[PDB]
Amino acid sequence: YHSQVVGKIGYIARCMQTIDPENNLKKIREDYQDVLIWAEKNYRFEEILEASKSGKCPNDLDALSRRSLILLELLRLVSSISPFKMKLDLIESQYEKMKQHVNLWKSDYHVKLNQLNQLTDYLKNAAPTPKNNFLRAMTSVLQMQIAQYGITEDNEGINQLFKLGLHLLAMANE
Amino acid sequence: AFIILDEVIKVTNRRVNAIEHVIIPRTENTIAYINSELDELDREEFYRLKK
Amino acid sequence: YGAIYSVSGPVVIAENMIGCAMYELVKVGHDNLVGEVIRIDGDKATIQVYEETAGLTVGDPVLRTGKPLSVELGPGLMETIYDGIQRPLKAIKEESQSIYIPRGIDTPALDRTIKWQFTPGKFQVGDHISGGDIYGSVFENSLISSHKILLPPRSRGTITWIAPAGEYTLDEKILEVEFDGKKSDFTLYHTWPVRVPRPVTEKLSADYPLLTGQRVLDALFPCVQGGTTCIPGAFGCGKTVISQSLSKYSNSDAIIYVGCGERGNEMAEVLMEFPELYTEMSGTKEPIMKRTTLVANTSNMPVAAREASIYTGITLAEYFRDQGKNVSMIADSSSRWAEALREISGRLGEMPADQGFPAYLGAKLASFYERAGKAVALGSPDRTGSVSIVAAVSPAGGDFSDPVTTATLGITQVFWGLDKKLAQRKHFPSINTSVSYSKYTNVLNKFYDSNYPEFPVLRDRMKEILSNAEELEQVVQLVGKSALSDSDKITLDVATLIKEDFLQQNGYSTYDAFCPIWKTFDMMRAFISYHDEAQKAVANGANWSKLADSTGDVKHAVSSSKFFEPSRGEKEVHGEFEKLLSTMQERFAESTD
Amino acid sequence: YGAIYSVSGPVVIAENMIGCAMYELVKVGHDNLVGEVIRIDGDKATIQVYEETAGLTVGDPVLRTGKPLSVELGPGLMETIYDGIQRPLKAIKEESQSIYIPRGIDTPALDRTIKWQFTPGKFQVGDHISGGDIYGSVFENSLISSHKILLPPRSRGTITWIAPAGEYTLDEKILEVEFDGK
């Protein structure tokens, strides 16, 4: 029970340190100060498991998995928008907006991140073709519009480019 | 119409009396003996396994 | 160490076996037969052997290997057919010269002569890891990575040595992690016991739909991904064609074929029918066979392979759901596993309490359904995954009210019908419209009410029309056909078009055997609008033959909507049903006059 | 008397039977639970426990009641509610304040606080007595008496002690029979 919470705290601290190394995100690092405090100093896993077993550290696997799902969705959304860079305040506002919702399996952010992750995963191992070039250009313009507008504001161009990207990805080579 | 209804009522009463008189007892009497035979057959295998 | 106490049937009892758990595998006799000690009675332990015993003598030595009996999980599960104990029948067919291995031999859990491309995940040197985290990735499909290499449960530590990107086999180490001192060596495959299920962080209700390619199955209830459903059969209904059409019409990232026991032709029909089918998302080299993992266990083998086949299929289904992908598990049938457990209870000589079945059959059958379902993915990443469990049921005690259907109906959440006599009358896949229930209809209909039209009112009206058609059929049969009003003729005509359009099917997927949810709701909306237009036209003064003959091409086009595929529309709905919705309103005024 | 050999489920098994009949009721353990010996297999006797067997362990004594499982017949049966095992419902309603009897009840089947007036019959000293003859009368109703004091079955002899008239309780003796000694 405590090993999953210590692994979620270590994965949250390692994902928070790998996400922003400059430490210019006070919104994401503000709520995760209790997990980054036991990850920013020298300590063993037995001290974190013993500290979490005694009720001194965070031991909620549901809240740590829920925040770890939003952190993994923000890291996958930030990594899938390459080679376009977004603003840190827009990423902190998108993480603060996604963190304010308890449900993370029916929301539009998980469907948009899964829709961009499906086009990026399908375009990662694709072959050079005209449908892959048009879907790569539409996925690049959708990645630029997703990096410029974020994932919290609904736009018709992102939905039309996502539907055209899914329809082009669902098509065969004939 | 009166001659048609007077001819239809004698067939309807005889059909309803025949079906209602012949319906329930064979299925009920067969179902009771089938339930008792299923109870005894279910009891004998438990009695041998307990023995 | 141990001594052979007594060998009766396919299960052997060995005495002098003390100090062993219910999961460690050992060799019985001097031939090194594959087996596992499940339970023990006093000084003698009962161990079920997966191979037949016809040359094993009493008094042979039986020593434990010193580890739990588990199957190998990793790259090589997809694109290959295996048995209930993780045995390749393809390599054993050409190598062993038979479909089954001989007695006294043991095969590996996976092929070691094939190499895969190793890809480093989100873990590196110095980062902490735990069980369920994605430490690597493999190529299991031609479109994207569908088989991710994850760590085993109950393990964790820091990555001290990480292999780079490239090609490597399943026998070379590519990972090393030590939490307290030296933890263990890491390879491409992973070891885990099939008797213990995989853990999870938390379970959640299903809110995502999963199409199965069934008109009556999707029309009767909303298809979801992550629920439980039962199908009643008699071994003659034609469930192999529904499993082939459901596997071909499915669009999930992973496929789980779990066969506890069959005659033999059903396992070869799925393997031979798997390469002929094509995926609905992209074409590749054997997309139907390479995209799903099939475990085929026959009914001529011992009860240990059929009993462990459900645990290996549940562990393989939970392994794909633990990575974060949507998997569809099709199991057939649980009555062979319950009959194998009743045969093991009869071989053990224990007194039953279920009319000839063991007391632990209901706990294992109810506990087997709890392993599948949608929930949070286990691991540091916390991904979203789901597993749809479709297990067909059948009678196994000589009655329609046995404990397998009682525990399966109570432990399950969806109720699906099946008729062998109705399926023989050209009505397959048939389902019961009067006895059925589902709890995910409100949750699946909640997103379907916003992202689509009101299919839930048409489902309740279509169920009410089929419920009223059975009540009108008894009065029409007993009292007479020309003794009913004109109001029941519209309900019987709508019930005949709904039963002919939804219940009517031909082959597996031939002749337009695919049907989306939006095409089914749009097809049922024309039947409900035609039935409401006929009932509203008959109320304002109109003949029954004048309105039924006044319909004409509307009933023929509505009844003939099972041959129009989805190529006529854009991707989901058909434009001919949208024009037929206005054509029914324009024909409703001409049908009244 | 006997020793508790094992307790599995609602039935209790007790060994060391040295004369315990299969019709006498006794209390197993130290809780005084209701039970009776239904069958016996060798030295171990099988007794069915009709109460909760919680708190019973192996190695406890079994005390017999000294007679078969029956009910007491006397004055005070009218205007009272009891169970089939002869349990006092008014005593449970006075002490526990409920209508259900608790586990481990060992009270008598009749109330001893309501005294009745005993009157002697036509039998005198010197004449022989037998079971069935009216030895006296006791009031049991609220206004008149309907409970006739008669001799119990399986008893006969001479009236060695003749109790006089007056008020007495159910626990106190009022008559003594002399046949083959005490």
Added chain:
Amino acid sequence: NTVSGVNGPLVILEKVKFPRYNEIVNLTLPDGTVRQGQVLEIRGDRAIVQVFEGTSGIDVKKTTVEFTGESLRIPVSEDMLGRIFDGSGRPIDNGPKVFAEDYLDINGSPINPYARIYPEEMISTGVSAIDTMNSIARGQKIPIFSASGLPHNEIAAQICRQAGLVRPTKDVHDGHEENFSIVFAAMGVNLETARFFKQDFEENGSLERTSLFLNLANDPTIERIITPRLALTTAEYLAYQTERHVLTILTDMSSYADALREVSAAREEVPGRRGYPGYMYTDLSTIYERAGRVEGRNGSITQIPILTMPNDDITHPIPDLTGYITEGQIFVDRQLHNKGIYPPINVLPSLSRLMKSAIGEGMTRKDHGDVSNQLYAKYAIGKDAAAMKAVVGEEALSIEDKLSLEFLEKFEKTFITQGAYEDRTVFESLDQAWSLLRIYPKEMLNRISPKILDEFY
């Protein structure tokens, strides 16, 4: 000492018989996993104990067992509401402890706190047909009979979810002035069905006043059978100790009968016909003994058991044997659920022994008992009039069969169908019954008194 062997769900242990019956025992494994169990049978130089979680993975010469020395008891308190716990009294939400102030064992109410008395107060559950046609009183047992064709778990969760809001509307009507509590117990339910009852109870607002007990089908039957005595003792502790009306929902009886028939029916006992032994009536009578009127004259324990048939068959001994103990029953039809009615229960085959005389007064009118005969007679006449209209046709249908045929669809589409977040009362149910009965004329209503019919149409 150590584990002797394992045969099926029961595990044989070689420990001594020093421990008593119902004594908790802990199995110490060499892998770092400790499991708890209950002593089902103890003998000389041997003991039979059942594992609470799992039955495999215990060594026979390497795993040892020890006796804690404490009997099986559940801590009953008033702070147990608003928390999700397991089938043995352990919290699964990761929150605090139980915090119970008294230690009472669950073995069938050995204290004898209940008393045999007739009910004198009306109890409601938020259903118009359930409260009006087959309404039960305080201390009256009324079971719900269903089959495998309808959502009996959603109806059982909706019955407990509908309870709790009738106390403020009844308190505004000058009815009862005491607090009401709810007792929820789940046995053999899934994770999605268990979370759906918690989401429905949290959305309805009755989760703060009710206690939830979660029992899954993957666990043993000892925890699912131990959970009903803990829920009945928890409802009886608040009902007897606090003197408040508490309603307990025990679902499902099919999982308890299957767990009782599956385990503890083949060791030294023999089963009856169809695998159901004759000791199940004492097992259901042990849970039924902890329900009824209590001492004080201000609180009672209401028992609403849920019984689901396997295929809607009447040849099983569980529905016939269970129906004789209860005072009435409520039958639900599968044809009503296919039409689109929520709930699909019908008051045509349901009956109550003491409905009007069992309920009290103060929140219910006197015409509610008389309107149920006219509504049941109108629905029963409309049920035969529906087939009589198709049999006779459109030129031989009487006006009485047509008015009952329209009153069957109008009363069926408005009195038995309701939402999942709405609430009903006795005055709203009586006004809806008067509005449904107002379609008929004054010359066709003869199943009630003329003063109540002339006063309310």
Added chain:
Amino acid sequence: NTVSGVNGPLVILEKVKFPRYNEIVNLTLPDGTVRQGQVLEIRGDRAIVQVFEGTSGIDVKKTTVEFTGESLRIPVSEDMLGRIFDGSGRPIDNGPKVFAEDYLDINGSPINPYARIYPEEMISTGVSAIDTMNSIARGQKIPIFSASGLPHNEIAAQICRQAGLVRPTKDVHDGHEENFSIVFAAMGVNLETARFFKQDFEENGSLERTSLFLNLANDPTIERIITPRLALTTAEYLAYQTERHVLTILTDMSSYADALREVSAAREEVPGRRGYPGYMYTDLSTIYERAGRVEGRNGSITQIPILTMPNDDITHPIPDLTGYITEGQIFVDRQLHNKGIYPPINVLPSLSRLMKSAIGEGMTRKDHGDVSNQLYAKYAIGKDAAAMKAVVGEEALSIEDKLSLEFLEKFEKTFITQGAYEDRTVFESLDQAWSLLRIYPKEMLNRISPKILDEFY
């Protein structure tokens, strides 16, 4: 050592565990004759085996036992057909040797005969309803259903008489262009029925290509149950060695199921419900495990067992247990045999899930599956209207019930009536089914596609 005891037909002897499982043993009696036996089960210095010949004649304390050192194996060769042999070894036409060139087990442990693909080669037995409605092929497992009271031996003699002439009719269809062999195994059959079955094969001209295995009813059940494993091992050895098509007829399964109930009466195992043991599915799975296509992609071993219902229904353990291992069956009706028909096989309780995979190209048509569903729907409509026509009468029946009633009488006396020596083709059976199905209109047929129904209309 010596015979410890005897319980029923099996004897319990106390010996050493030097012999293997299923090893042949020789019991030395003091009467001057030695008997052979098979080790049914091994124990801790105890053995339970049954004598192959006789049950009486052994001693108690003066008996002698000896181990042969070889397991039970029958020598199979290519010269076994044509000659007459017995199951236990009674030589009437056999010599000292059986002409066996290789040693194979009687259980199929190292062989594992099973098809890994769907059957393409269509096999016909000379029945229009069986071949058209079922669509059986090579490597399929479909047993014949019988009843108690009807002529099951006449139907088995007609099916055995039809075996042998199916090769010339199947050669014209292009479904079988190889060698054909018949494997006859008898157990618990009468001498007159075996003489009539051998006289049917001798009259058909298949005595040289067929093998006969004779087993008496007064012999032990181990020899009668052991004869079908040796016959299936000889048919699998002859069919696998030469790539030929072998058809195995096993009659009767009721004698093997009744003989299996007598066994296990002195061992640790016990019987289950209805007198039959719970491990009978593994015993029938051992005989049915050697059925299917052989390895090599050439030839196959088909199995067609003959089972008779003792209660005239499928709820018994013999037809219900054997029907679960297969994928359907053919139901024979005694009502058609009472009015006069040969064979009296019905199409209502008959269904096969391998009809689509069996039908291919060049040896069958595509409209046979829709014509079989249309004929099954018309036969089900006529049989359903025939039972309702007796109660109400002909005054409430429409023209649709009269069309199915006339189609049931027209198809009942045409498709079910056939000879015992002539084999009807599948094209003539489909053409005869189209004439019986051509009595209704084209719009009244909906069990087929419109493109294939419009072309073959």
